[PDB]
Amino acid sequence: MENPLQKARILVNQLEKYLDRYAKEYDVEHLAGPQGHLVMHLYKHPDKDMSIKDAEEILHISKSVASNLVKRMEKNGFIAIVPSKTDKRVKYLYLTHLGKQKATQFEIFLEKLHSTMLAGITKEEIRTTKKVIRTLAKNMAM
Amino acid sequence: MENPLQKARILVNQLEKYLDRYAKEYDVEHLAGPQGHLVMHLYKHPDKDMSIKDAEEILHISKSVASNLVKRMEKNGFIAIVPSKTDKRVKYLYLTHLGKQKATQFEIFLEKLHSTMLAGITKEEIRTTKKVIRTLAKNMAM
Ligand code: HEM
Ligand code: HEM
Ligand SMILES: [C-]#N
Ligand SMILES: [C-]#N
């Protein structure tokens, strides 16, 4: 008589469009997913080294994905990839000047995005919503 | 650092898979969307006539969609389409014996689907979830 599926897909689509437009305004296109995670990780932990191997573990991705991801981040100019001097088979990642800028813009983006999105919704309402979604998922799992 | 989009798409996909499997078990494949709405409408109001024109208005669809929908329902054997005797340009819809069976199975399906899906979730929790979803949508609408 009525369909919450189509309703739900329309909403997720809207959310994606919203997110994309918002990211463009903050000039952090590309950072929405795993690029942004890695940029923010590198940005928050600049004392420490990160090999591609480390990035695999931190993002929980495969060798081929991590490989593609970092090559694209290098293309973007967000990171440098420099082989270990001692063992030129270990590859270390360095967040560039541009990568640091991208990180600072991403943080602002995230702050403003949540303020806009979550206006007039309480921490409790969120907790409730999260419990419901999560009970639904469980109820379906056969 | 994390993505509720992909999370949300995975959940809707799961829900669609759940729904499909559930519908097959109740033998009401095809009825999930507009076919089922029309079958249930016809089933609940058998005193009254429904032209294709009426079905357009009741489902809020276009002439070409309604046309395709009813031809498919006729293929399925859920309805007969009989032109008005007086004016063979008005087309009336009749829910067949099989269409009535489909309707009764659909009602049971819907009852069991909601019981399973909504186990351990209160009317209040639902109302809260619905308010949140709805505030989100509003917050995004530019
Ligand atoms: C690219 C998209 C997004 C990213 C990268 C992201 C990332 C994050 C992160 C890291 C936090 C934790 C903040 C902290 O406490 O340290 C957070 C909080 C939250 N996010 Fe997102 N988020 C995104 C989009 C969304 C969307 C689309 C929604 C809802 C539609 C959402 C709902 C929330 C909620 C409810 C919180 C908790 C707010 C709080 O800190 O009290 N997020 N997000
Ligand atoms: C083919 C799929 C579905 C159809 C045709 C459908 C149709 C309906 C209809 C007609 C009602 C109103 C019952 C009444 O009070 O007369 C209802 C109730 C409801 N549906 Fe659905 N529904 C479907 C799937 C879902 C799904 C997937 C969800 C959630 C994931 C959902 C959530 C609800 C809720 C919360 C109610 C209110 C329950 C109540 O009566 O208290 N429905 N549904
Ligand atoms: C039920 N929607
Ligand atoms: C934020 N998830």
TrEMBL record, chains A, B:
It comes from the Bacteria. Heme b 2 binds at H114, K123. Heme b 1 binds at M1, H114, K123. Residues 1-138 form the HTH marR-type domain. Keywords: DNA-binding, Heme, Iron, Metal-binding, Transcription, Transcription regulation. One of its GO terms (biological process) is response to stress. GO terms for molecular function: DNA binding; DNA-binding transcription factor activity; metal ion binding. This is HTH marR-type domain-containing protein. It comes from Streptococcus agalactiae serotype III (strain NEM316).
